[PDB]
Amino acid sequence: QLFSKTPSVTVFDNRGLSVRDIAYRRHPDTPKVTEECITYHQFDFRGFLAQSLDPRLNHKEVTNFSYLTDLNGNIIYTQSVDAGNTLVLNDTEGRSVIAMTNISRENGKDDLSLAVTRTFQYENAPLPGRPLSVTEQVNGENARITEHFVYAGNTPQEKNLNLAGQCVSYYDAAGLIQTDSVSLTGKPLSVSRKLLKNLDDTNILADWQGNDTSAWNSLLATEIYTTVTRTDAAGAVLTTIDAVGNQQRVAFDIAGQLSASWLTLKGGQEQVIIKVLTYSAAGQKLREEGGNGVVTTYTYEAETQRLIGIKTERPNGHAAGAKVLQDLRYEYDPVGNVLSITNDAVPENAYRYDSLYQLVSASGREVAGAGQQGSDLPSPLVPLPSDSSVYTNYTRTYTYDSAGNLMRIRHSAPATNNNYTLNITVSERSNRGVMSSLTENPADVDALFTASGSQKCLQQGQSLIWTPRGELRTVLLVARGETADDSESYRYDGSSQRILKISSQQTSARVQRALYLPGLEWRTMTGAENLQVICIGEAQVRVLHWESGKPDGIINDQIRWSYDNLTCSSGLEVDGDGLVISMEEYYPYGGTAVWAARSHIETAYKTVRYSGKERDATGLYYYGFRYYQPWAGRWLSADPAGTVDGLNLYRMVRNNPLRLTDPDGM
Ligand SMILES: [K+]
Ligand SMILES: [K+]
C-alpha cells in the first residue's frame, strides 16, 4: 500500500546511455509524502562516464565522482568525495602497472603529500611476463617491495609434484607462502606459511629487495606452518591436516554435496561433527544432524525457495531430553523483506521499511536495563534465564538521508526507561559520517578521515592508523603519551586477509596474540594461555584445545556448535552433549541486545557473533576487507570495490541488514 507509484526508473540520452536513476522514497509514517530521489550520470564527448551525483549532493553542487579515461573508456583518473582521488594504469597486456591512492584537494591542485604509489612488476622477455613483484611507496618515504613471486621450473622433481609453471614461493607482507605439492587435479596438496621475524613490532615491515631467496629466508622466523590437503577425483577437498596436526574429514553424497564431517584431534580418535546432512531439491540444506545429537531443520517456501523456518532442537529420545532450542519463523513481504520473526520455546520482531526497502522500524527485546549502546558488549547474563520477564521490549527507529546515510537510530525502551538516540553526523560534501560524540558539525567530519576516506578516530580517545593499502593497522585504545598505550594491531597477507592480531594492555603487560591459519586460530595470552581453536566448516563448529592455561569449568577439546539465523549471525553455542552454552541476540545493525551464558568463564571464548564475523575487543567487526561499526550502522572506511553497490561507499548492506549480509567488506 505504501508502494503505489514507486517504481525504479532509468532515464536515457539519445545514445543509449543511462543519464538518470530515479527512485521514489516513501515512509510508512507519512504515506502522502513521496520524495523523488534522482541520481545523475553525465557522459562525455566519447560516450564514457564522466560524472555521477547522488540526490543529496547534486543539490549542493558537489560531484560524487569524476572520471578521466583513455580513448577506450578505461578509467585512468578518478575524483571521489568518499574515497578521495586516485590514478591507475594498466599495460598493453592488460596488467595493472600503477595505482596512486590517498590523494586530496584546497589550493586547487591535487595534494600528493600523503599519496601512496603502488607499482607492479612482471617477468621481462623472454619470460611469459608472469607477476614478478609488487612495490609500495608512500610519498617522501622509501619504496618497499611488499610482494615477490618465484616460479618452479621443468625438472622431473618439480613435475612429479605438479609444480611446473606454478608460483611456488609467494613473499607477502607477513612473510612467505610456499606451495609444496599440487594434486593431479591442479589443487594445492601442501602449503607452508613462514612468518616474518618480529611481527610483534609494528615498525618492522616486509621489504623483499633483490632476487635472492637466501637473503630473505634469513628474515623469517623459524617455525613452519604447513597445511596439508587431500582432494578427491573431482578436485574437492576430502581431508585437511592443519599446522598442529588436527584432521578435518568430509564426505559427499551421490550428488556430491557435503553429507558428513569428522574431526580427529592430534593423538585422538576420529569423532563425528556432522553425522548426516540432507538437501532440498534446490540444493539448500534441509536437515542437519550433528555429533551432539542436535538436529537443525530448515523449512522453505515452495513458491519462492525462501527460508521461512530454522528449527534447532534436541529431538525425541535425546539423552539430555527433547527440547526446541530455537524455532525461527520468517514472514516476508512480496519482494522478500523480512517483515517478522517469531521464536518458539511469543517473542516477536516486527519490521517496517520504506519504499526503497530501507529498514525504518524494528521491534525486539533486550536485557533491560542495559544502557546506551556503544562499542562494548553488554555484561553477560549468567546463568541462562528461566524467566523471560528478564527481557524488555524495545523499538528502534532509523532515519536516513537522500544519499542513504543512516543519520539517526532512536532507541525506545519505555518500560525500563532505557531511551536514547544515536546520532550520526554526516558531512555536507561527502558521505563521511561519524557518531555525534566525535563531532556534531558536518563541516568537521571530513578531517576525521584520511584522503582515502578511512576513519582516523574510532571514539573520543581512540585513534586509527592505516596501512598504505588501506588496511587497518592499529587501534589506539588508551593513549598515554609516551609511551605505554593500550592498543591492538593487525597484519595482513598479500590478499589483504588478516593473519595476525596483537592486543596490548597495561596492568607488566597483558599481551593477547591471534594467529589466523587455514582452519585454525592460534591464540596466546601473556602477562600464560595457549589456545588452539579448530575451525570446522566454511565457522559453524569450533573446538577449543588448550596446550596451556585451560581454565577450570571447561573441559579440554571443547566442541561448540554454532546455530545461526537468516543472515548467518551466531545465536546459539551448544556443547558436545547438546546443551546450550550461550545465547545471543542482535540489534538489526549488529549491536548485541541479549548476551547470556551458563557460566561466566565460557563467555570469553566466543569471538564470532554478528553475520558470522569476529567482533574484536575494539568493538569492530572484521569482515575481511573492511571493519564494521555495529553502533554507527556503517563501514569504518570507503568501499575498496568502489561503486559496485551504489555511490555511497559507507552504506551498510543497502540499509536492509535483516535480509542482506556482507561477505567480506569489499
Ligand atoms: K518501490
Ligand atoms: K606429474
XYZ file of C-alpha atoms and ligand atoms in Angstrom:
668
model
C 0.000 0.000 0.000
C 2.948 2.295 0.757
C 4.479 1.309 -2.569
C 1.846 2.570 -5.039
C 3.532 4.582 -7.816
C 7.070 3.918 -6.516
C 8.846 2.313 -9.465
C 12.534 2.275 -10.308
C 13.275 4.319 -13.414
C 16.270 4.555 -15.738
C 16.446 7.652 -17.969
C 18.453 7.573 -21.195
C 20.112 10.076 -23.510
C 19.996 9.841 -27.305
C 22.901 7.388 -27.475
C 21.667 4.603 -25.177
C 23.383 5.901 -22.066
C 21.777 5.880 -18.620
C 21.852 9.510 -17.515
C 19.360 9.230 -14.639
C 18.477 6.720 -11.913
C 15.134 7.702 -10.378
C 13.758 6.231 -7.150
C 10.709 7.195 -5.111
C 11.102 7.277 -1.328
C 8.001 6.961 0.842
C 7.940 6.475 4.599
C 5.062 4.467 6.113
C 4.510 7.209 8.722
C 3.919 9.857 6.036
C 2.355 7.936 3.106
C 1.216 11.158 1.413
C 4.805 12.334 1.020
C 6.819 10.861 -1.837
C 10.406 12.005 -2.332
C 11.724 11.716 -5.872
C 15.355 10.685 -5.427
C 17.400 11.344 -8.558
C 20.938 10.091 -9.224
C 22.632 11.823 -12.155
C 25.118 10.410 -14.642
C 26.937 12.637 -17.114
C 28.739 11.164 -20.114
C 31.495 12.840 -22.136
C 32.060 13.508 -25.848
C 33.339 9.928 -26.280
C 30.315 8.277 -24.685
C 32.082 7.417 -21.430
C 31.035 8.118 -17.829
C 32.442 11.415 -16.575
C 30.321 12.424 -13.573
C 27.960 10.798 -11.059
C 25.920 12.678 -8.447
C 23.656 11.439 -5.643
C 20.298 13.180 -4.987
C 21.629 14.921 -1.865
C 24.956 16.360 -3.074
C 23.695 17.346 -6.528
C 21.502 19.924 -4.799
C 24.658 21.332 -3.188
C 26.735 21.410 -6.391
C 29.258 18.752 -5.380
C 30.211 15.856 -7.630
C 30.376 12.399 -6.022
C 32.610 11.053 -8.795
C 34.652 12.455 -11.690
C 36.404 10.240 -14.232
C 39.040 10.751 -16.908
C 39.560 7.850 -19.292
C 41.684 6.782 -22.257
C 40.350 6.634 -25.828
C 38.670 3.299 -24.974
C 36.801 4.288 -21.800
C 39.194 2.747 -19.316
C 39.337 4.956 -16.227
C 42.771 6.466 -15.568
C 41.962 9.269 -13.118
C 39.170 9.425 -10.513
C 37.892 12.069 -8.081
C 35.780 10.664 -5.246
C 34.260 12.679 -2.386
C 34.270 9.469 -0.331
C 37.431 7.677 -1.492
C 39.498 10.684 -2.469
C 41.365 10.991 -5.754
C 43.135 8.064 -7.457
C 45.213 7.295 -10.545
C 45.512 3.859 -12.121
C 47.088 2.467 -15.266
C 47.242 -0.943 -16.936
C 49.696 -2.122 -19.608
C 49.182 -3.376 -23.172
C 48.905 -6.919 -21.820
C 46.014 -5.680 -19.697
C 48.029 -5.981 -16.482
C 47.948 -3.363 -13.721
C 51.196 -1.406 -13.653
C 50.435 1.559 -11.388
C 47.988 2.714 -8.680
C 48.362 6.029 -6.841
C 45.951 6.493 -3.953
C 45.282 8.594 -0.838
C 45.258 11.923 -2.708
C 43.220 15.005 -1.721
C 42.478 18.614 -2.762
C 42.025 23.068 -1.206
C 44.698 25.106 -3.006
C 43.053 23.912 -6.211
C 45.600 21.283 -7.233
C 45.935 17.669 -6.063
C 47.751 17.132 -2.753
C 50.345 14.365 -3.130
C 51.879 14.862 0.328
C 50.406 11.563 1.529
C 49.886 9.829 -1.809
C 50.562 6.086 -1.832
C 52.121 4.745 -5.039
C 51.872 1.005 -5.648
C 53.567 -0.362 -8.769
C 53.516 -3.856 -10.241
C 56.499 -5.567 -11.870
C 56.356 -8.552 -14.204
C 58.765 -11.055 -15.728
C 60.568 -9.432 -18.634
C 61.070 -11.046 -22.040
C 61.785 -13.752 -22.988
C 59.762 -14.905 -19.963
C 55.949 -15.223 -20.200
C 55.604 -11.998 -18.204
C 54.237 -13.565 -15.032
C 53.836 -11.357 -11.929
C 57.307 -10.674 -10.514
C 56.921 -8.236 -7.628
C 54.766 -5.562 -6.016
C 56.374 -2.332 -4.844
C 54.738 0.092 -2.416
C 55.949 3.631 -1.808
C 54.449 6.305 0.417
C 55.276 9.903 -0.552
C 58.506 11.208 0.998
C 59.459 7.718 2.142
C 61.478 4.886 0.617
C 59.856 2.274 -1.613
C 59.274 -1.154 -0.120
C 58.870 -4.294 -2.226
C 55.848 -5.808 -0.497
C 55.376 -8.815 -2.779
C 57.558 -11.251 -4.706
C 56.754 -14.322 -6.773
C 59.005 -17.282 -7.532
C 58.019 -19.940 -10.072
C 59.072 -23.591 -10.357
C 60.872 -24.990 -13.411
C 60.635 -28.049 -15.651
C 62.693 -30.516 -13.614
C 61.352 -34.070 -13.060
C 61.350 -33.226 -9.354
C 59.012 -30.296 -9.967
C 56.803 -32.174 -12.442
C 56.335 -35.129 -10.076
C 54.970 -32.638 -7.559
C 52.972 -30.957 -10.348
C 54.665 -27.594 -9.694
C 55.884 -26.667 -13.189
C 54.785 -23.130 -14.052
C 53.284 -22.617 -10.604
C 54.126 -19.777 -8.234
C 55.898 -21.974 -5.707
C 57.068 -19.112 -3.478
C 54.989 -16.078 -2.502
C 56.588 -13.397 -0.350
C 53.958 -11.046 1.076
C 53.608 -8.561 3.939
C 53.573 -11.355 6.526
C 56.420 -13.453 5.201
C 56.354 -16.496 2.933
C 53.843 -18.968 1.482
C 55.418 -21.982 -0.193
C 53.463 -24.402 -2.350
C 54.953 -27.833 -1.651
C 52.682 -30.128 -3.654
C 49.868 -29.935 -6.215
C 47.176 -32.531 -6.892
C 46.675 -34.325 -10.192
C 43.547 -32.175 -10.350
C 45.546 -28.951 -10.137
C 44.784 -28.379 -6.453
C 47.323 -27.487 -3.732
C 48.060 -30.535 -1.535
C 50.643 -28.892 0.706
C 51.187 -25.234 1.562
C 53.515 -23.794 4.202
C 53.457 -20.361 5.835
C 56.519 -18.826 7.473
C 56.155 -15.590 9.395
C 58.423 -12.593 9.050
C 60.582 -12.356 12.178
C 59.332 -9.961 14.894
C 55.870 -9.148 13.512
C 55.133 -8.192 17.142
C 56.990 -4.923 16.466
C 54.637 -2.796 14.370
C 57.561 -0.846 12.893
C 59.079 -3.867 11.179
C 57.771 -4.099 7.614
C 58.264 -6.538 4.743
C 60.747 -5.450 2.060
C 61.811 -8.165 -0.377
C 64.717 -6.461 -2.140
C 66.666 -8.089 -4.965
C 66.254 -11.571 -6.425
C 67.858 -13.799 -3.777
C 65.653 -16.019 -1.615
C 68.591 -16.984 0.615
C 68.829 -13.433 1.933
C 65.066 -13.344 2.530
C 64.685 -16.670 4.339
C 67.033 -15.250 6.984
C 64.383 -12.609 7.751
C 61.768 -15.266 8.512
C 61.049 -16.766 11.914
C 61.986 -20.439 12.210
C 58.541 -22.001 12.651
C 56.896 -23.529 9.578
C 53.107 -23.595 9.439
C 52.133 -26.316 6.996
C 48.562 -27.102 5.953
C 48.139 -30.397 4.091
C 45.120 -31.176 1.912
C 43.884 -34.320 0.187
C 41.341 -33.893 -2.611
C 39.074 -36.335 -4.492
C 38.967 -37.123 -8.221
C 36.707 -34.121 -8.852
C 39.153 -31.796 -7.132
C 37.086 -31.419 -3.967
C 38.890 -31.354 -0.605
C 38.453 -34.565 1.412
C 40.954 -34.293 4.268
C 42.780 -31.388 5.907
C 45.661 -31.572 8.370
C 46.279 -28.170 9.951
C 49.605 -26.761 11.139
C 49.308 -28.518 14.524
C 48.185 -31.869 13.139
C 44.432 -31.940 13.613
C 42.439 -33.534 10.801
C 39.115 -32.497 9.352
C 37.430 -35.031 7.087
C 34.380 -34.658 4.875
C 32.267 -36.989 2.763
C 29.896 -36.137 -0.066
C 26.629 -37.726 -1.150
C 25.757 -39.265 -4.521
C 25.135 -35.718 -5.793
C 28.498 -34.530 -4.474
C 27.016 -32.433 -1.672
C 28.659 -32.392 1.781
C 26.988 -35.293 3.578
C 29.172 -35.832 6.635
C 32.143 -34.428 8.511
C 34.514 -35.692 11.181
C 37.323 -34.417 13.374
C 40.484 -36.162 14.544
C 42.436 -34.067 17.040
C 46.166 -34.846 17.083
C 46.681 -38.061 19.047
C 42.932 -38.550 19.289
C 40.328 -40.753 17.602
C 38.015 -39.679 14.797
C 34.752 -38.189 16.061
C 31.545 -37.039 14.364
C 30.984 -33.314 13.840
C 28.293 -33.642 11.220
C 26.627 -37.032 11.079
C 24.086 -36.551 8.296
C 23.106 -33.580 6.114
C 20.224 -33.612 3.625
C 19.295 -31.032 0.997
C 16.230 -29.594 -0.741
C 15.685 -30.107 -4.460
C 17.282 -26.675 -4.877
C 20.397 -27.876 -3.063
C 19.698 -25.913 0.115
C 20.416 -27.586 3.460
C 17.246 -29.295 4.689
C 18.065 -31.431 7.724
C 21.419 -31.357 9.526
C 22.271 -33.669 12.416
C 25.499 -33.084 14.339
C 27.589 -35.214 16.672
C 25.809 -33.747 19.712
C 22.557 -35.323 18.582
C 21.193 -31.861 17.860
C 19.096 -31.513 14.698
C 18.540 -28.374 12.638
C 15.634 -28.491 10.192
C 15.248 -25.839 7.503
C 11.787 -25.006 6.175
C 11.398 -23.330 2.792
C 8.579 -21.627 0.908
C 7.643 -23.796 -2.079
C 6.900 -20.945 -4.484
C 9.997 -18.895 -3.718
C 12.578 -21.190 -2.091
C 12.734 -18.612 0.704
C 13.883 -19.758 4.138
C 10.849 -19.372 6.416
C 11.886 -21.814 9.129
C 15.009 -22.578 11.155
C 14.475 -25.169 13.878
C 17.332 -26.292 16.113
C 16.258 -28.934 18.611
C 17.234 -31.878 20.726
C 14.946 -34.453 19.065
C 12.804 -37.115 20.719
C 14.888 -39.715 22.522
C 17.838 -37.405 23.058
C 19.978 -38.232 26.097
C 19.519 -34.727 27.517
C 15.797 -34.662 26.794
C 13.724 -33.445 23.856
C 13.722 -29.643 23.550
C 13.296 -26.996 20.864
C 16.385 -24.818 21.307
C 15.391 -22.363 18.587
C 12.441 -22.081 16.194
C 12.800 -19.043 13.936
C 9.805 -18.281 11.723
C 10.149 -15.641 8.998
C 7.365 -13.646 7.337
C 8.238 -11.683 4.193
C 6.658 -9.016 2.023
C 6.074 -9.954 -1.635
C 9.510 -8.524 -2.525
C 11.268 -10.518 0.189
C 11.950 -8.111 3.042
C 11.767 -9.729 6.481
C 8.543 -8.356 7.942
C 8.535 -10.515 11.048
C 10.387 -13.135 13.086
C 8.973 -15.413 15.781
C 10.768 -17.887 18.073
C 9.036 -20.824 19.772
C 10.245 -22.244 23.101
C 5.502 -15.408 21.914
C 8.626 -13.284 21.318
C 8.296 -11.400 18.024
C 10.357 -8.961 15.993
C 8.429 -6.723 13.616
C 9.994 -4.683 10.845
C 8.928 -1.747 8.725
C 10.661 -0.487 5.610
C 10.345 2.492 3.263
C 9.524 2.196 -0.456
C 13.275 1.827 -1.053
C 13.296 -1.189 1.273
C 15.349 0.651 3.876
C 14.726 -0.516 7.443
C 12.914 2.306 9.255
C 11.499 0.468 12.270
C 12.458 -2.603 14.278
C 10.885 -4.112 17.376
C 12.724 -6.578 19.568
C 13.762 -7.490 23.089
C 16.891 -6.729 25.107
C 18.073 -7.364 28.629
C 16.885 -4.142 30.227
C 18.254 -2.141 31.611
C 21.381 -2.453 29.510
C 22.293 1.198 28.998
C 23.146 3.210 25.880
C 24.634 1.088 23.083
C 28.318 1.632 22.390
C 31.313 -0.384 21.241
C 31.052 -2.685 24.274
C 29.163 -5.952 24.671
C 26.609 -5.956 27.491
C 27.737 -7.778 30.637
C 26.705 -11.407 30.086
C 23.597 -12.616 31.898
C 24.696 -15.682 33.872
C 23.329 -18.237 34.064
C 20.684 -18.903 31.412
C 17.352 -17.161 32.182
C 14.440 -19.329 33.311
C 12.006 -16.424 33.165
C 11.518 -14.079 30.202
C 10.469 -11.110 32.291
C 14.242 -10.584 32.460
C 13.880 -9.156 28.950
C 12.069 -5.980 27.960
C 10.735 -4.949 24.586
C 12.380 -2.145 22.620
C 11.525 -0.322 19.421
C 14.162 1.351 17.251
C 13.559 3.911 14.534
C 16.013 4.610 11.714
C 16.478 7.879 9.847
C 18.291 8.116 6.509
C 19.127 10.994 4.160
C 18.745 11.252 0.365
C 22.089 9.503 -0.177
C 21.254 6.588 2.108
C 23.343 7.780 5.043
C 21.922 6.496 8.310
C 21.682 9.674 10.377
C 19.612 8.576 13.367
C 18.927 5.481 15.478
C 16.216 6.249 18.034
C 16.100 3.578 20.729
C 12.869 3.419 22.700
C 12.585 1.084 25.693
C 9.634 2.638 27.575
C 9.098 0.203 30.481
C 12.632 0.349 31.868
C 13.101 3.888 30.594
C 16.182 2.907 28.597
C 15.629 5.587 25.961
C 18.383 7.094 23.815
C 19.225 8.362 20.345
C 22.414 7.552 18.477
C 23.099 10.396 16.053
C 25.396 10.193 13.079
C 26.766 13.500 11.827
C 27.221 13.451 8.064
C 29.471 15.763 6.038
C 27.781 18.213 3.673
C 30.229 17.492 0.860
C 30.656 13.713 1.218
C 29.209 10.502 2.666
C 31.741 10.580 5.512
C 29.891 10.328 8.812
C 30.767 9.796 12.461
C 28.874 9.487 15.736
C 27.923 12.860 17.241
C 30.236 12.280 20.224
C 33.129 12.864 17.822
C 31.577 15.977 16.303
C 28.122 17.402 15.687
C 29.393 19.745 12.981
C 29.083 18.406 9.402
C 31.941 20.710 8.391
C 34.432 18.903 10.637
C 33.599 15.319 9.633
C 35.942 15.056 6.616
C 39.028 15.992 8.643
C 38.396 12.888 10.744
C 39.171 10.713 7.707
C 42.229 10.105 5.521
C 42.376 11.270 1.916
C 41.362 7.698 1.030
C 38.277 8.021 3.225
C 39.452 5.821 6.097
C 38.338 6.950 9.574
C 41.138 8.272 11.819
C 39.308 8.294 15.166
C 37.100 5.437 16.321
C 35.854 7.110 19.505
C 36.929 10.140 21.559
C 40.248 8.896 22.959
C 40.728 6.238 20.293
C 42.727 6.820 17.089
C 43.086 4.749 13.903
C 46.255 4.123 11.899
C 46.049 2.637 8.409
C 48.353 0.764 6.026
C 49.178 2.223 2.586
C 46.781 -0.334 1.058
C 44.033 0.982 3.317
C 44.175 -1.956 5.721
C 43.538 -1.268 9.412
C 46.930 -1.243 11.129
C 46.493 -0.082 14.743
C 43.599 0.736 17.063
C 44.899 3.030 19.802
C 42.565 2.217 22.701
C 44.142 4.099 25.615
C 46.795 6.657 24.731
C 49.342 7.500 27.428
C 51.523 9.971 25.535
C 54.923 8.370 25.956
C 54.870 5.561 25.618
C 52.709 2.798 27.092
C 49.407 2.542 25.256
C 46.503 0.105 25.304
C 46.387 -0.905 21.633
C 45.594 -3.647 19.140
C 47.483 -4.134 15.888
C 46.860 -6.198 12.784
C 48.795 -7.852 9.972
C 47.522 -8.973 6.581
C 48.675 -11.323 3.811
C 49.164 -10.228 0.192
C 45.455 -10.760 -0.438
C 44.779 -8.300 2.399
C 43.460 -11.098 4.601
C 44.190 -10.851 8.302
C 46.915 -13.197 9.509
C 47.879 -11.648 12.851
C 46.218 -9.656 15.669
C 48.105 -8.298 18.695
C 46.328 -6.659 21.651
C 48.280 -4.948 24.437
C 47.006 -3.661 27.786
C 48.842 -2.111 30.747
C 48.307 -3.667 34.182
C 53.846 -5.706 33.279
C 51.719 -6.006 30.126
C 48.782 -8.226 29.125
C 49.524 -9.282 25.534
C 46.944 -11.260 23.519
C 48.088 -12.710 20.176
C 45.870 -14.250 17.474
C 47.405 -16.114 14.539
C 44.978 -16.962 11.747
C 45.778 -20.066 9.678
C 43.736 -22.464 7.493
C 41.044 -23.950 9.720
C 42.848 -22.660 12.796
C 43.156 -19.788 15.270
C 46.274 -19.812 17.450
C 45.623 -17.528 20.430
C 48.168 -16.823 23.181
C 47.638 -14.740 26.331
C 50.569 -13.389 28.375
C 51.031 -11.055 31.347
C 50.168 -17.793 30.039
C 47.327 -19.303 27.994
C 47.987 -21.253 24.803
C 44.774 -21.903 22.908
C 44.288 -23.611 19.564
C 40.854 -23.061 18.008
C 39.925 -25.652 15.389
C 37.537 -24.056 12.907
C 35.241 -26.573 11.223
C 33.083 -25.720 8.215
C 33.100 -22.663 5.940
C 32.882 -21.132 11.004
C 29.903 -23.228 12.169
C 31.646 -25.626 14.568
C 34.601 -24.608 16.764
C 36.823 -26.683 19.071
C 38.869 -25.245 21.934
C 42.091 -27.156 22.584
C 44.407 -25.828 25.269
C 48.102 -26.637 25.268
C 48.376 -24.434 28.359
C 46.257 -22.359 30.719
C 42.987 -24.267 30.461
C 40.630 -22.538 32.937
C 38.568 -24.632 35.331
C 34.926 -25.020 34.330
C 35.700 -26.000 30.733
C 36.872 -29.466 29.596
C 39.716 -29.532 27.076
C 38.964 -30.082 23.396
C 35.557 -28.473 23.905
C 33.251 -28.612 20.898
C 30.951 -25.633 20.316
C 28.245 -25.861 17.668
C 27.050 -22.501 16.366
C 23.464 -22.050 15.203
C 22.676 -19.050 13.072
C 19.731 -17.080 11.736
C 18.798 -15.972 8.215
C 21.788 -13.604 7.997
C 24.307 -16.074 9.447
C 24.533 -14.445 12.907
C 25.818 -16.796 15.613
C 22.865 -17.111 18.005
C 23.443 -20.303 19.993
C 26.587 -22.033 21.203
C 25.900 -25.682 22.065
C 28.319 -28.279 23.516
C 29.013 -31.911 22.622
C 26.242 -33.060 24.957
C 23.700 -30.900 23.161
C 23.449 -28.389 25.986
C 23.162 -24.642 25.421
C 26.382 -22.849 26.421
C 25.443 -19.323 25.328
C 22.647 -17.427 23.576
C 22.987 -14.083 21.822
C 20.567 -11.739 20.084
C 21.410 -8.729 17.942
C 20.105 -5.279 17.127
C 19.414 -5.089 13.358
C 22.726 -3.372 12.588
C 24.872 -5.648 14.725
C 24.799 -4.402 18.302
C 24.267 -7.143 20.874
C 20.878 -6.800 22.574
C 20.989 -10.066 24.507
C 24.073 -11.906 25.788
C 23.682 -14.883 28.130
C 25.649 -17.980 29.148
C 25.577 -20.906 31.588
C 28.877 -19.673 33.086
C 30.980 -16.511 33.096
C 34.118 -18.383 32.040
C 32.633 -19.770 28.818
C 31.755 -16.263 27.604
C 35.324 -15.195 26.843
C 35.734 -17.888 24.194
C 33.058 -16.709 21.779
C 34.600 -14.412 19.177
C 32.290 -14.892 16.185
C 28.886 -13.204 16.546
C 27.104 -10.948 14.048
C 26.891 -12.127 10.425
C 29.297 -14.944 11.294
C 32.024 -12.343 11.712
C 34.504 -11.854 14.541
C 33.952 -8.962 16.915
C 37.349 -7.793 18.117
C 37.832 -6.319 21.597
C 37.748 -2.904 19.899
C 34.064 -3.437 19.177
C 34.712 -3.575 15.440
C 33.570 -6.477 13.320
C 36.264 -7.690 10.927
C 34.721 -8.788 7.632
C 37.897 -9.259 5.590
C 38.476 -6.082 3.620
C 36.760 -3.600 5.929
C 35.941 -3.201 9.603
C 32.356 -2.548 10.607
C 30.918 -0.322 13.320
C 27.769 -2.008 14.651
C 26.974 1.089 16.750
C 27.012 3.537 13.830
C 25.465 1.254 11.201
C 28.217 1.864 8.629
C 31.704 0.831 7.467
C 34.902 2.193 9.028
C 36.280 3.068 5.582
C 35.201 3.596 1.956
C 34.361 0.551 -0.223
C 37.608 -0.597 -1.883
C 35.481 -2.142 -4.623
C 34.121 1.316 -5.393
C 30.681 1.915 -6.872
C 29.661 -1.750 -7.243
C 26.907 -1.298 -4.636
C 25.836 2.306 -5.183
C 27.522 5.693 -4.912
C 27.628 5.704 -1.109
C 30.883 3.956 -0.176
C 29.959 3.696 3.508
C 26.376 2.403 3.237
C 25.862 -0.921 5.001
C 24.105 -3.699 3.054
C 21.778 -1.160 1.402
C 20.235 -0.347 4.796
C 18.493 -3.737 4.984
C 20.564 -5.810 7.449
C 17.812 -8.364 8.149
C 17.562 -9.649 4.602
C 21.065 -8.868 3.380
C 24.534 -9.878 4.590
C 28.027 -8.781 3.520
C 30.620 -11.499 2.933
C 33.890 -9.505 3.036
C 33.507 -5.720 3.092
C 34.796 -5.279 -0.489
K 9.389 0.599 -4.897
K 53.183 -35.188 -12.689
